[PDB]
Nucleic acid binder design. Structure first.
Ligand SMILES: [Zn+2]
Lengths: 340, 207, 40
RNA sequence: UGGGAGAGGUA
């Protein structure tokens, strides 16, 4: 007789994004741990609380091993002969009957283990709300900064984390304002924080262009490569199979509208739009703009270019402290050399 | 997490009103060993403890401690902001002092600041929608439209601007927003960061 | 009569000797565990 | 918890 499991199934039921069998597993692990700690002998009793009755029978376990320690769980092949060799070497089934009592020490350790189980079950709730949609621009309010991370939320008691290295260098987020970020690939097994969200990745700019531009949305214009100097300067690479709509004019929009939108959403980062081409030589003479081309030596084995450049455009060709050469090399994959 | 219990413990002895008191055990902690743990956790993470006690108006002397630590942080961090990095010594010390004091008053500002509570919600930021109660029957809540949910009038950053242009007169509002105000927001983010790391070190001590 | 006459008793003998059920197996197993001795 | 009376005692 148990009206209490009936309270589990209707009266003290969970939030409805959590299954009932996990709650039954939580309570069965709770009573198993409670009878485990209470017995003075080192018995790893695992009790099978059957679902429909509520009451149960305490089950001290036994695994088929040939070791010398743990006699309370040490059964052998000749003990598996009692069930005549119909099992496996090492599974922890039982062949015993025990009883159960209650105590306030059992109550408090059961409270500890059930708040651990509902904690990891809520963690699995955030796991399935992550795995329902893989990679998108999201918005949450920052609520508690830290030394190495910025904790976030997505509503419904979810949490996300901006780490230190994947944010803007000009970040200033007082707790209480809404920020934009992209969850990319989080750890569903992480016991602490899981949802790793960035603000200074190429995935950020391409997802921002995806939500911004409808022809990125429906695959008319496509972006192939990207380049980032976070907060200051950027480059992305555009090719297009369609011949109707102007690609660069489309992604700059009406008087630099889309570029200024991503620039103010990114923090003043000068995203410099440039074409993507398939062939290496003509791709890179398209790609180092606004620098000028004298002669190009294309190298295959160590994946580099050699660029002759006339005098006058060296500063805007290299950027500031080698910014443009570095950004163009991690754009194209070919690191650049200086030639006059 | 851990820190606000110590702010409960900084009060005087309050009278109890219940039946049989005095558990007389070490169930949670005493009231003196929490202060001893605050002392043990002061050699590291003293910024956040000073800022927390100055924010919650318990031990109203470490407001100056938090302003001094913020001034030291601004002196260490001022070499990345173009508006402040070109000024001379005592003038840069005085602008760092005035924006440190205003940044700390902006961090301190909650619904208990005199003259800062919302007019309608009285700080709760949660009013009752009468139409949803009339159609649903039950009682509902909504966001207080005047305060927009936060429950208090926020501190405008232009107060520090008005208090610095009595000293730097040739600094207008666009360059204030362009190369001065990020330092101010860096100061308030540093206040929140130091309070979080002090709560973390407190929980590491009293564990 | 002795634990010196239990030490040579292999786990095959403990379950092939008559009228030693699961409860008697636990009754000898927990007392050899509390006495520290092992068997097998 | 912690307040007030009354009684006795120590230097
Ligand atoms: Zn309000």
């Amino acid at each position: 007789m148990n009206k209490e499991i009936l309270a589990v199934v209707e009266a003290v039921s969970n939030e409805k994004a959590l299954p009932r069998e996990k709650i039954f597993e939580a309570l069965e692990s709770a009573l198993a741990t409670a009878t485990k700690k209470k017995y003075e002998q080192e018995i790893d009793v695992r009790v099978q609380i059957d679902r429909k009755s509520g009451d149960f029978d305490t089950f001290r376990r036994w695994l088929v091993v040939d070791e010398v320690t743990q006699p309370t769980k040490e059964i052998t092949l000749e003990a598996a002969r009692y069930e005549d060799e119909s099992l496996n070497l090492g599974d922890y089934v039982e062949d015993q009957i025990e009883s159960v009592t209650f105590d306030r020490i059992t109550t408090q350790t059961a409270k500890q283990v059930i708040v651990q189980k509902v904690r990891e079950a809520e963690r699995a709730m955030v796991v399935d709300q992550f795995r329902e949609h893989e990679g998108e621009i999201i918005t949450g309010v920052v609520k508690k900064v830290n030394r190495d991370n910025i904790s976030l939320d997505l509503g419904n008691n979810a949490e996300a984390v901006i780490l230190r290295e994947d944010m803007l260098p000009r970040e200033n987020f007082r707790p209480g304002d809404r920020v934009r970020g992209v969850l990319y690939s989080v750890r569903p097994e992480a016991r602490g924080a899981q949802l790793f969200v960035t603000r200074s990745k190429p995935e950020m700019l391409i997802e921002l262009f995806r939500i911004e531009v409808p022809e990125i949305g429906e695959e008319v214009i496509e972006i192939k490569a990207a380049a980032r100097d976070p907060g200051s300067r950027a480059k992305i690479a555009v090719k297009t199979n369609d011949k109707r709509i102007d690609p660069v004019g489309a992604c700059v929009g009406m008087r630099g509208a889309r570029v200024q939108a991503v620039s103010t959403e990114l923090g003043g980062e000068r995203i410099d739009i440039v074409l993507w081409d398939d062939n290496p030589a003509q791709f890179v003479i398209n790609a180092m703009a606004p620098a000028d081309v004298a002669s190009i030596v294309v190298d295959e084995d160590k994946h580099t270019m050699d660029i002759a450049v006339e005098a006058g455009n060296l500063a805007q060709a290299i950027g500031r402290n080698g910014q443009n050469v570095r950004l163009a090399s991690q754009l194209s994959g070919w690191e650049l050399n200086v030639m006059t | 997490m851990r820190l606000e219990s110590v702010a409960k413990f900084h009060s005087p002895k309050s009278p109890m009103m219940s039946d049989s008191p005095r558990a007389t055990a070490s169930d949670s902690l005493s009231g003196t060993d929490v202060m001893a743990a605050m002392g043990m956790a002061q050699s590291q993470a003293g910024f956040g403890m000073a800022a927390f006690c100055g924010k919650h108006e318990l031990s109203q002397n470490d407001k100056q401690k938090a302003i001094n630590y913020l001034m030291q942080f601004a002196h260490k961090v001022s070499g990345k902001y173009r508006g402040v990095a070109k000024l001379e010594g005592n003038t840069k010390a005085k602008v760092l002092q005035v924006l440190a004091t205003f940044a700390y008053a902006d961090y301190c500002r909650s619904a208990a600041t005199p003259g800062a509570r919302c007019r309608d919600c009285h700080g709760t930021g949660r009013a009752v929608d009468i139409a949803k109660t009339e159609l649903w029957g039950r009682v509902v809540e909504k966001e207080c439209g005047r305060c927009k949910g936060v429950g208090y009038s926020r501190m405008p950053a232009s107060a520090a601007y008005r208090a610095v242009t009595m000293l730097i007169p040739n600094l207008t509002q666009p360059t204030w927003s362009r190369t001065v105000k990020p330092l101010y927001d860096a100061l308030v983010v540093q206040c929140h960061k130091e309070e979080s790391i002090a709560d973390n070190i407190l929980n590491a001590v009293t564990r | 009569h002795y634990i010196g006459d239990l030490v040579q008793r292999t786990e095959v003998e403990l379950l092939k000797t008559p009228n030693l059920g699961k409860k008697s197996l636990t009754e000898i197993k927990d007392v050899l565990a509390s006495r520290g001795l092992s068997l097998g």
